Amino acid sequence: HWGYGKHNGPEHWHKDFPIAKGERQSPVDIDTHTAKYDPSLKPLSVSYDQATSLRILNNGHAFNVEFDDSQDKAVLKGGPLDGTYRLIQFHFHWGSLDGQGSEHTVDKKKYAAELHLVHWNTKYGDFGKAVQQPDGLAVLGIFLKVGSAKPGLQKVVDVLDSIKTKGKSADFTNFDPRGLLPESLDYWTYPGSLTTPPLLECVTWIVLKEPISVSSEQVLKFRKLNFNGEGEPEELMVDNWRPAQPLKNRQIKASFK
Ligand SMILES: Nc1ncnc2c1ncn2CC(=O)NCCc1ccc(S(N)(=O)=O)cc1
Ligand SMILES: [Zn+2]
Numbered sequence: 001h002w003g004y005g006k007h008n009g010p011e012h013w014h015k016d017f018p019i020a021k022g023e024r025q026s027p028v029d030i031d032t033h034t035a036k037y038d039p040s041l042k043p044l045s046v047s048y049d050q051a052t053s054l055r056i057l058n059n060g061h062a063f064n065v066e067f068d069d070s071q072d073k074a075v076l077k078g079g080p081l082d083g084t085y086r087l088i089q090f091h092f093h094w095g096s097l098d099g100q101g102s103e104h105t106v107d108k109k110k111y112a113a114e115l116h117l118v119h120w121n122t123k124y125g126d127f128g129k130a131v132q133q134p135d136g137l138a139v140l141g142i143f144l145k146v147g148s149a150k151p152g153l154q155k156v157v158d159v160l161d162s163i164k165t166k167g168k169s170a171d172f173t174n175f176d177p178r179g180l181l182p183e184s185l186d187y188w189t190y191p192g193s194l195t196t197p198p199l200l201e202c203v204t205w206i207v208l209k210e211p212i213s214v215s216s217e218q219v220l221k222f223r224k225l226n227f228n229g230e231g232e233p234e235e236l237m238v239d240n241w242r243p244a245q246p247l248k249n250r251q252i253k254a255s256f257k
Contacts, residue, residue, distance in 0.1 A: 002016065
């Protein structure tokens with residue numbers, strides 16, 4: 001099965017998922033001088049006040065905080081998007097060292113980790129239909145740098161002990177994802193894909209310019225998670241990121257100058 005090791009990592013994925021070499025793969029490097037300011041872009045509308053978190057799961061590749069997406073409770077609208085996109089889950093990708101871990105890069109700079117808030121287009125009825133559509137998903141990406149602690153992240157950090165290994169889950173209600181956002185909603189946007197198998201080309205990427213800061217202690221606790229299941233040889237869950245892919249026939253647009 002696919003993973004992030006020497007023998008099953010990103011350089012191998014194309015053999016089972018040929019779209020890995022496709023025309024709109026993610027992540028990409030964001031070249032800040034060649035992204036174009038687009039004044040037609042509308043401001044992002046992040047409406048998370050009625051968010052209903054349910055559960056946190058270690059799925060063997062990252063951990064997901066899952067939300068009730070059976071009504072319009074936590075939605076993303078505006079920006080490049082047409083329609084309403086519902087929040088279904090968020091997760092992170094991170095490194096073994098503070099100098100790496102993000103999937104997107106900015107002028108080839110790597111951040112310590114990257115947060116993905118995953119949303120799907122309600123006109124397609126459910127998430128499984130949406131991933132089959134070129135405008136099915138909107139993923140809001142937020143860079144993490146190491147510095148001061150992020151208070152809104154600590155509730156996540158404190159439950160990781162209970163989901164150390166693949167397949168473990170825990171109740172995770174009443175979490176407010178607004179605590180994970182930076183001050184500014186300035187962003188870059190481009191059409192891309194899921195960054196793990198099945199690598200489907202269904203995502204409008206919205207990557208915020210402003211990183212959030214997290215503490216050394218917070219990211220260290222990410223790195224104590226396990227890729228393996230309970231009773232299997234311990235392999236630390238680190239460096240679960242795909243590197244930058246060719247931009248091909250795409251232009252990255254900026255909401256700001
Ligand atoms: N009908 C279908 N066919 C095939 N698979 C289906 C499916 N229904 C569900 N699934 C699983 C799937 O696709 N899950 C995608 C999970 C995911 C990966 C990466 C990101 S990320 N890193 O891009 O944010 C965000 C989300
Ligand atoms: Zn992701």
